[PDB]
Design a binder for this molecule. Structure first.
Ligand SMILES: CS(=O)(=O)c1ccc([C@@H](CC2CCCC2)C(=O)Nc2nccs2)cc1
Ligand SMILES: OC[C@H]1O[C@H](O)[C@H](O)[C@@H](O)[C@@H]1O
Length: 434
């Protein structure tokens, strides 16, 4: 009836966050960023603000030739990159795509990397680059760590040497690949399974490094924001439950509000509360619905994609052992919207904090800035992006923000990620042959 509808909305309204609540979160983010950057508070800081050593200017001159290896869904690409400084860097690329033959043995990671190493060997032969002992970086283009696996497989072969360099953080790969397309890109963010951001900070503010001139990318690791109690007043019963059953209770609390790792589980616990109150599924949950992890984050995106006929919603609930009414389906859609909208708003406060801080750190007036973004939630969820953009903009009055997602293009954005990875390894003295 009408009382039931009202009660559902009363429960779902606990998820709402007011502009004033988001301004609070935003200022507290700014305060935690300041703490992670300072030598005296770095150890107690929740938000670690890791120096990435990626500078706004070119470094590692010595590295002018390198390999980039792009791992896709089913294929991989080996690319030879040559940087010329005879300008704004002159880049030649030569490449080859490889598919796995059906007869190849790829049952283990070791087996797959044996195959990959063999293709690298062939490629190095075709281009006469074997004796050069080039550095190599990884990139990913998906629809045990790879650096270690490749290093081990190349050693097993014993016919060539390479320096396989450390990867940059995914937020940093995102910033660099987007920077390739738009030089005003100075923020990288990921809203996927996890959530994090990086940005270009003034060297003088990065106390953990030597030097007061220029800018360096800083990896906030902001998923741990709240870990000193900063978010406690916003935590709901569902958040406390998610935290309790997690691998790390008490930690990554900000990430637990936003990330795809937990978003479906939040909705599951909301649905169980509405069931316990006799407001949903005639007050009976299935065995599947009472199972941790059963409501997948992808179901949240799918529910919110429903055209209005509730057919997609029904089919999800059916597979979870339920026989929903039309009202049940609509309540489930509202529960999803509630959880996902909160994730967008919490995320928006963090990015607003970063952006407003940069404007303050630099200001000559209206700050015009490009933010590069990737991740499954940001890209696949039907309305997260729109809600997130609207909220960030409300919180950043004196800024003009352009959001961008990198495209594959000819693979030159990925080449720049690998150039930076290899030149960073050079500068840090990590190359055993360069
Ligand atoms: C204009 S340019 O000359 O082509 C040019 C090429 C690369 C850089 C930077 C990387 C950019 C991507 C995002 C931040 C700036 C760089 O090599 N930083 C490094 N830091 C450590 C090793 S390499 C700057 C200018
Ligand atoms: O994948 C997005 C993010 O997830 C987690 O927060 C990781 O700690 C961080 O390093 C990563 O950038």
């Amino acid at each position: 009836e009408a009382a039931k509808k009202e009660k559902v909305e009363q429960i779902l309204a606990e998820f709402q966050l007011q502009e004033e609540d988001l301004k609070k979160v935003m200022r507290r983010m700014q305060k935690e960023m300041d703490r992670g950057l300072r030598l005296e508070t770095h150890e107690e800081a929740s938000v670690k603000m890791l120096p990435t050593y990626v500078r706004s200017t070119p470094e590692g001159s010595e590295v002018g030739d390198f390999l980039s290896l792009d791992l896709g869904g089913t294929n991989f690409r080996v690319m030879l990159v040559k940087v010329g400084e005879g300008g704004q860097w002159s880049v030649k690329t030569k490449h080859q795509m490889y598919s796995i033959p059906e007869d190849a043995m790829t049952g283990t990671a070791e087996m797959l990397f044996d195959y990959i190493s063999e293709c690298i060997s062939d490629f190095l032969d075709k281009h006469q680059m074997k004796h050069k002992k080039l550095p190599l970086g990884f990139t990913f283009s998906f629809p045990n760590n790879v650096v270690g696996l490749l290093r081990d497989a190349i050693k097993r072969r014993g016919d060539f040497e390479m320096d396989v360099v450390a990867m940059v953080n995914d937020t940093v790969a995102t910033m660099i690949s987007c920077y390739y397309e738009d030089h005003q890109c100075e923020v990288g963010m990921i809203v996927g399974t996890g959530c994090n951001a990086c940005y270009m900070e003034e060297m003088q503010n990065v106390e953990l490094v030597e030097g007061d001139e220029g800018r360096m990318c800083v990896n906030t690791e902001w998923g741990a924001f709240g870990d000193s109690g900063e978010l406690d007043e916003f935590l709901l019963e569902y958040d406390r439950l998610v935290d309790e059953s997690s691998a790390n209770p008490g930690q990554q609390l900000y990430e637990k509000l936003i990330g795809g790792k937990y978003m479906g589980e939040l909705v599951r616990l909301v649905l169980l509360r509405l069931v316990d109150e006799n407001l949903l599924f005639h007050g009976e949950a299935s065995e599947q619905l009472r199972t941790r992890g059963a409501f997948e984050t992808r179901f949240v995106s799918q529910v919110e994609s429903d055209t209005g006929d509730r057919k997609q919603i029904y089919n999800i609930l059916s597979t979870l052992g339920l026989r929903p009414s039309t009202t049940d389906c609509d309540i489930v859609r509202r529960a999803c919207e509630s959880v996902s909208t909160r994730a967008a708003h919490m995320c928006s406060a963090g990015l607003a904090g970063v952006i407003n801080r940069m404007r303050e750190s630099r200001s000559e007036d209206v700050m015009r800035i490009t933010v590069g973004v990737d991740g499954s939630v940001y890209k696949l969820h039907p309305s997260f992006k729109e809600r997130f953009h609207a909220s960030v903009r409300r919180l950043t009055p004196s800024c003009e923000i352009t959001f961008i997602e990198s495209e594959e293009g000819s693979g030159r954005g990925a080449a720049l990620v690998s150039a930076v990875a290899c030149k960073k390894a050079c500068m840090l003295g990590q190359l055993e042959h360069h």
